[PDB]
Amino acid sequence: SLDILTPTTLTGDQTFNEDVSVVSSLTLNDGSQYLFNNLLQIAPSSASVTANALAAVSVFTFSLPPSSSLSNSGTLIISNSNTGPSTEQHIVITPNVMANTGTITLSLAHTNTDSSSTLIIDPVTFYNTGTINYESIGSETNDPSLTGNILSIGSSGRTLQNLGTINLNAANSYYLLGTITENSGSINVQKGFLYVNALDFIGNTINLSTTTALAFISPVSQVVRVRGVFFGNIIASVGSSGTFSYNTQTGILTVTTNGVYSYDIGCGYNPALMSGQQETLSFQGNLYDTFLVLVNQPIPSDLTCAA
């Protein structure tokens, strides 16, 4: 219905009850509320949508509700320059279908936790062969360790077909609540901690940067592929009385608390250098005893396992 065929810039709050097809570039400025209630189609790859929150205002909402559908082969940027402990934002991407073969970038200046913000990616169906980014354009410090403003991906019982890349590079923490699938996908934890509380975790590789962490709140039956493991990061597993073992032939790290967690970290690690310790983590406002594994060594030069 609404077709953007020439570079367009719109001002103020926007509520799209029509299907929106963008083949050029659409820019949304000076609005505290951007709503796409039906189709939002961005194609071909050179097309783009950029939603800029109104500056120096209290609340910001970007919404793709369950009535909507997202089909992006170009570039969708959601940017909010508002920052500070009183910031309230609601970036709620919950379309019936979320199909991305291009780039989606969440670019926020308010990345600290708070009491009231929501950052949600939880459609019914999730399809990503491109790149989804969460980046910071702020400089906030002194996080209050609250439960709001934590990017939460998926939900219990729904799946996420991640054939491409999810880049997490903005905040102290992120939550993965849905079931990831597809063998080619990667989740890159470039800053902060990733907490996983999901029914299963299939196919993807979790790549940890330095001074990041992966924490599984509940064990999954799948072996979880994690790469980048070295003295700069850790894998945490919820539960008390933690023990662990590393198999040099398969490259699999097995952690046992009250449940069994299995991580494929690669071959080449020396198990005699590894150690573990009990700590306490916070997840969705509750404290959990957690067993941490520190490999205490660099990434091996060759991660391949013997046949």
Residue numbers in the entry: 18 to 324
Relevant lines from the article:
Though it lacks typical virulence factors such as hyphal development, C. glabrata contains a remarkably large and diverse set of putative wall adhesins that is crucial for its success as pathogen. C. glabrata wall adhesins are large, modular glycosylphosphatidylinositol (GPI)-modified proteins. The A-regions of Awp1 and Awp3b consist of 34 and 33 β-strands, respectively, which form a two-domain architecture with a parallel right-handed β-helix at its N-terminus (Awp1: S18-V240 with strands β0-β26, Awp3b: D20-I254 with β1-β26) that is followed by a β-sandwich domain with α-crystallin fold (Awp1: V241-Q314, Awp3b: V255-E334; both with strands β27- β33).
The Awp1-A crystals belong to space group P43212 with two molecules per asymmetric unit and diffracted to a resolution of 1.85 Å. The Awp1-A structure was solved by MR using the Awp3b-A structure as template, followed by 20 cycles of model building in ARP/wARP. Structural similarity between the A-regions of Awp1 and Awp3b is evident from a calculated root mean square deviation (RMSD) of 1.36 Å for 223 Cα positions. Additionally, Awp1-A has a truncated turn comprising only PB3-T3 at the N-terminus (β0: S18-P24). Another feature of striking regularity can be observed along the PB1 sheet of the Awp1-A β-helix. Here, a Ser/Thr ladder stretches over 8 β-turns along the exterior face at the beginning of each β-strand (S42, S65, T92, T120, T148, T182, S203, and T222). In a +2 position, a second outer stack consisting of four Thr and four Asn, interrupted by an isoleucine residue, stretches along the whole PB1 sheet. The four asparagine side chains (χ1 ~-63°, χ2 ~-53°) resemble the interior Asn stack by forming a hydrogen bonding network between the side chains’ carboxamide groups. The A-regions of the Awp1 and Awp3 subclusters are almost all predicted to be heavily O-glycosylated at the α-crystallin domain and the following cysteine-comprising stretch (Awp1: 8 sites; Awp3b: 16 Sites), but not along the β-helix domain. Furthermore, there is no Ca2+ binding site predicted for Awp1-A because none of the lanthanides from the crystallization condition was observed in the Awp1 A-region structure.
